[PDB]
Amino acid sequence: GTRPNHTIYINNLNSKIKKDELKKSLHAIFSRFGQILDILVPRRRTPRGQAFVIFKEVSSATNALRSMQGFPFYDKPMAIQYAKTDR
RNA sequence: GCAGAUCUGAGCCUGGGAGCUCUCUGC
Ligand SMILES: [Mg+2]
Ligand SMILES: [Mg+2]
């Protein structure tokens, strides 16, 4: 179970992309919904196509989730959820 | 300790990946 907050968690991402390019791409797509504070691509033992996007306002996160839910991104559909704990 | 680093460092856990530890670099 989750509830809305500033951050959104995205998995099922193209792991063949460089971490740098993935950040710049996510910023260009999601910044349309509002102001972004930071994008976090954590380092894991294996590439698992995970990323976080932290907006300044929750409204930006709610609209970003609904809109890009399942929308293609680098030939793969995005699975988006809310973050467990606020950032 | 903070920050970063492996489809281009590594051992585990998991076996339907929001997990643990180590190592390297900078401070
Ligand atoms: Mg597995
Ligand atoms: Mg050290």
Author numbering: 5 to 91
Anything the authors wrote about it?
The viral trans-activator of transcription (Tat) protein uses an archetypal arginine-rich motif (ARM) to recruit the host positive transcription elongation factor b (pTEFb) complex onto the viral trans-activation response (TAR) RNA, leading to activation of HIV transcription. Using yeast display and multiple rounds of selection, a new class of TAR-binding proteins (TBPs) was identified that bind TAR with nanomolar affinity. Here, we present four co-crystal structures of lab-evolved TAR-binding proteins (TBPs) in complex with HIV-1 TAR. Although it was hypothesized originally that each TBP variant would recognize TAR using fundamentally different modes of binding, we demonstrated here that each TBP binds TAR using a conserved subset of arginine-to-guanine interactions within a lab-evolved β2-β3 loop.
